[PDB]
């Protein structure tokens, strides 16, 4: 489910669905998406869904917190 479609290359390259995220650069309770997203439409809306916010992050495994950065 995305992939980068609505990530930066690199470090931020994850997109998950969070909780809420902290600090600027953390990711919190963050879940793979449900849904492949092309877009911020689509991820805004696709993790709107689990009350959730689209981020980027290091990681593609869903983590309690994850160093993440908020989708474009
Ligand atoms: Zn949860
Ligand atoms: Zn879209």
Redesign the pocket.
């Known amino acids: 489910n995305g992939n980068g479609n609505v990530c930066p290359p690199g470090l931020f390259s994850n997109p998950q669905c969070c909780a809420t995220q902290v600090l600027g650069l953390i990711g919190l309770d963050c879940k793979v998406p449900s849904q492949n997203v092309?877009?911020g439409?689509?991820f805004r809306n696709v993790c709107a869904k689990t009350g959730a916010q689209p981020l980027c992050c290091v990681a593609p495994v869903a983590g309690q917190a994850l160093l993440c950065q908020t989708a474009v």
């Open positions: 092309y877009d439409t689509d």
